[PDB]
Design a protein around this ligand. Structure first.
Ligand SMILES: CCCCCCCCCCCCCCCC(=O)O
Lengths: 238, 251, 17, 223, 238, 17, 60, 17, 17, 17
């Protein structure tokens, strides 16, 4: 026969190889294809769908819908903090289990802007202004509205808009950040502050709630497929 | 004869001073096609791109050498340090000008070398050196003609002949460098670009450059000549860029 | 080689990449 | 009239070098091996790489796996050929804790199964850095406060290799050693650096003990 | 299938082979390339960079910068020798650990001219002439200036030039010389002698120092890659 | 053969010589 | 400079616009407009102080 | 390959599909 | 393949059929 | 095949016959 020489890697079974193999059912006639709605071609399409963020992830709220409710009320002071969490979409509990966070945990590196949407769910009679800020790392988390407003921020008026869409820009020294927590690739902090106050008429509940949504923007990408740490097993399922 | 003006500051050299340009690359602003941060950069220009003069050191007859970590050495210099404090990311080149004048009756030779990513070793093998030992900001850190003992827990191994990097000191000429021979020259000028594996970086957590001045031939003179010979270092940031404006960092 | 199908069935082909 | 082909960066680095070897025995549930991937545990390849400050290359991986029969008391030990599994776990992925762990399902983790007596297994790896080049040296810290870890180890987040016997244990223990070989290909190098003179001391830093610049001779005129 | 016949070398793992292998990360999207200064394409570029030669490599000078300092002074006689070392760039301690010598120790054969540069580091008031000579082998090292001047040599005047660049020519019976010491490929000797004297005015130090640099010329090349004898190990580094 | 890439990934190619 | 031809030296000549005090050290002085004068290279340095004022004219 | 007979006898050919 | 001689010697060829 | 060099080095070639 033709002279050949076998190289290293012969007879190996690499789980990510791409080779042809003989068919066990020659000339099998497959069922005709049928148009089904909702075809998906890339996991980024799933990652780009807004999902409700459990910002209130206290131990007493994770087993109910209170985890998604951000309290807000009329205060007697100024510049109080509403919430604050690190921008760790793949490692922080706040964003870990959303659609974006679940897609991220199948990968090792990520890059791109993050779309944050806040919808005010109080009465139509309520008014108020909020300061939503993103602080790049290097310093700590901002501790007051003065520190928060020195970075990227927007002013949200619930009286004018029931939904504010804040797109957190990608500001990093590297092209990609690790999905797991790593200080070398810290992404910063997201905080919200009272710009003026919640103001309501008589016979209106002063305590209201805000819902936060998260999704990837158009420039988002992931790399280095891996097994997720969210599913595990001890024996085969019978 | 030749004057170099940056901002409102000017230095003068001989018309044939032979400025050394890094690896043949002049400093330049980050291009769009190789940028990853999306926010608009801050380019202070004249306010930051100017000659800053650090504290002078004395070249003694037994001097072993000195070093400065580049971004840290200018961390308290005018608006450059303020922008460093107020921005998360930054990139910059440098124009390093070293001045040392002496009479024609003096002798001595210095190696002025700019070392990228000059990771230094610790006297204790199990530890790494602390920030105070690795850098003194404006103040210069001194090489030692002896070997630092292992007792010291977090000091830099400052033996000159290994240059704190476990290499041969005479092989430092591979990095951009100039020789100050008192017989011929009284100054050295090295222009270095931004050298890193990423387009931008944090100026406080990472020291991109290290300037070393090491006397290869010791200073000498006869009785009667001036015994005090200073060395003065003047550094100008070039094409300094910043990103991620937020609250000021404490450090 | 670069790309040649060795089998008569489409299921034998390598992945769509 | 004399070519410099063999002094190219490619020819200089495109030679397979052992970076580590690990052992594991089939006589326990903890009979697996792990290794955090790094190129700083061997003197030769580390010195060759550290002639430069930044590098960018693809990698060819080759494993040499050998086994040795351990002492046993059973008469007539007759073991079938052994099959091994090597699994790569990127950072953040679940890690095995025993030989029969569920993590060895390797549904998404890349893994290779290889049987003894055949050619060594081999796979290729692209440039997988989050930066634009690999870094051999890093004069900085991991924390913004300049406390804690200092040096090149801050940038090492390349993952872990796991190795185990696929076959169930028989009538006698078998101890296996897997040797890992790295071969950079399509190499790009920047910022040449003085060759390492003092002997290496630690994996995660550049610590050294001072040594003379050269060997000595009697006098300045000795030939 | 197609008839084939396996030849010797099948299944072997040769460390210097050049074959293709399957990728373990199909369709991985690498980080974009970025322009970095100081790209190196050949080790000869490193070998062509001047490095300071430890000519004074006595036992008391190798742990300081005195190893690089060549003493020179005003004498009361004529034709004294300043220094002398064999031209053994890969085996002699004088040139072993320079940039050129370190590149050479990764190879087995070498060929080409060697650039030697000497820089006088005395006072500007000092004057003097030196004879730098290269003696091809076959006889011994020259023992006086008369013997030295019979071979290749140049006259260096420190009063006119603070730096003299002597390019040692390639004179060999073979196209290449061994990096290791071997008498069959002896390369000769380099010596320096006082041509006239060091002369200084009053109030000037008569003792001065000379620095020597070495680098490969444009015709230099190396062959037969090998492991360097300068790095070794006993256990893995932890 | 002389030179044909058998894989769809550039990292699979042999060395640049 | 009216010293001997054998003398060498470098000087920092600085002009500080008002608003703060007079500079008290070389570090403060070099933060404003300044030039480095080397007597070994030039026996005469010509520094032209720029006009920096809020008004077009200043009182004598 | 796609389809090439390696033998001189028709009985050596693969199935008619 | 169909018919290609792999060797430089005629004795290496297959049978005459 | 008939004659195709599989390697980039001349020393890899078969004998001169
Ligand atoms: C069974 C599949 C095995 C997959 C193994 C993947 C190995 C990860 C790649 C490691 C790259 C190391 C780069 C070294 C960087 C440096 O020079 O510091």
């Amino acid at each position: 026969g033709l002279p050949v020489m076998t190289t290293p890697g012969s007879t190996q079974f690499l789980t990510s190889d791409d080779f042809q193999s003989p068919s066990a059912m020659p000339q099998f006639d497959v069922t005709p294809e049928m148009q089904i709605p909702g075809r998906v071609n890339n996991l980024m399409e799933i990652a780009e769908v807004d999902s409700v963020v459990p910002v209130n992830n206290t131990e007493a709220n994770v087993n109910s819908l209170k985890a998604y409710q951000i309290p807000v009320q009329s205060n007697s002071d100024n510049g109080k903090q509403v919430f604050g969490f690190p921008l760790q979409p793949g490692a922080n509990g706040v964003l870990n289990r959303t659609l974006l966070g679940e897609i991220l945990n199948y990968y090792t590196h990520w890059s791109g802007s993050i779309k944050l949407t806040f919808m005010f769910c109080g009465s139509a009679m309520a008014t108020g202004k909020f300061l939503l800020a993103y602080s790049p790392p290097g310093a700590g988390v901002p501790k007051n509205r003065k520190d928060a407003m020195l970075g990227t921020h927007v002013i949200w008026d619930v009286g004018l808009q029931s939904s504010c869409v804040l797109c957190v820009p990608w500001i990093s020294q590297t092209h990609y950040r690790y999905v797991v927590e790593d200080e070398y690739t810290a992404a910063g902090y997201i905080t919200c502050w009272y710009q003026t106050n919640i103001v309501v008429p008589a016979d209106v509940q002063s305590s209201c709630d805000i819902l936060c949504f998260v999704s990837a923007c158009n420039d988002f990408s992931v790399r280095m497929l891996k097994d997720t740490p969210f599913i595990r097993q001890d024996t085969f399922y019978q | 004869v030749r004057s170099i003006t940056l901002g409102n500051s000017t230095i003068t050299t001989q018309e044939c001073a032979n400025v050394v340009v890094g690896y043949g690359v002049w400093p330049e602003y980050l291009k769009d096609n190789e940028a990853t941060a999306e926010d608009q950069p801050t380019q202070p220009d004249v306010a930051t791109c100017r000659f800053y003069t650090l504290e002078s050191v004395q070249w003694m007859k037994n001097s072993a050498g000195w070093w400065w970590k580049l971004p840290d050495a200018l961390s308290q210099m005018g608006l450059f340090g303020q922008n460093m404090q107020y921005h998360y990311l930054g990139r910059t080149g440098y124009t390093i000008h070293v001045q040392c004048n002496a009479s024609k009756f003096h002798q001595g030779c210095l190696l002025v070398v700019c070392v990228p990513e000059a990771e230094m070793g610790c006297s204790n093998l199990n530890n790494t050196p602390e920030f105070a030992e690795l850098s003194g900001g404006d103040t210069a850190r001194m090489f030692t003609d002896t070997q630092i003992g292992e007792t010291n827990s977090k000091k830099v191994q400052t033996a000159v002949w290994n240059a704190g990097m476990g290499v041969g000191v005479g092989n430092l000429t591979i990095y951009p460098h100039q020789w100050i021979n008192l017989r011929t020259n009284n100054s050295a000028t090295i222009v270095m670009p931004y050298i890193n594996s990423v387009p931008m970086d944090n100026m406080f957590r990472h020291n991109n450059l290290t300037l070393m001045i090491i006397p290869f031939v010791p200073l000498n003179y006869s009785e009667g000549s001036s015994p005090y010979v200073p060395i003065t270092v003047t550094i100008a940031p070039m094409c300094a860029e910043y990103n991620g404006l937020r609250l000021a960092s404490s450090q | 080689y670069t790309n040649i199908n060795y089998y008569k069935d489409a299921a034998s082909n390598s992945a769509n990449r | 009239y004399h070519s410099r082909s063999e002094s190219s960066i490619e020819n200089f680095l495109c030679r397979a070098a052992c970076v580590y070897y690990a052992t594991y025995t089939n006589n326990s549930e903890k009979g697996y091996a792990e290794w955090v991937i790094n190129t700083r545990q061997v003197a030769q390849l580390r010195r060759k790489l550290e002639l430069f400050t930044y590098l960018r290359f693809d990698l060819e991986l080759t494993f040499v796996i050998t086994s040795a029969q351990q002492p046993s008391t059973a008469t007539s030990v007759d073991a079938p050929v052994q099959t091994h599994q090597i699994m790569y776990v990127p950072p953040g992925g679940p890690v095995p804790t025993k030989v029969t762990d569920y993590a060895w399902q390797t549904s998404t983790n890349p893994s290779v199964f290889w049987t003894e007596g055949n050619a060594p297994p081999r796979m290729s790896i692209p440039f997988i850095s989050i930066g634009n080049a690999y870094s051999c040296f890093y004069d900085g810290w991991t924390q913004f406060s300049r406390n804690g870890v200092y040096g090149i180890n801050t940038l090492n987040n390349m993952g872990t290799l796991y190795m185990r016997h696929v076959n169930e244990a028989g009538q006698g223990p078998i101890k296996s050693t897997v040797r890992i070989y790295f071969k950079p290909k399509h190499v790009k190098a920047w910022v040449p650096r003085p060759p390492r003179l003092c002997q290496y001391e630690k994996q995660k830093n550049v610590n050294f003990t001072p040594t003379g610049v050269t060997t000595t001779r009697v006098g300045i005129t000795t030939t």
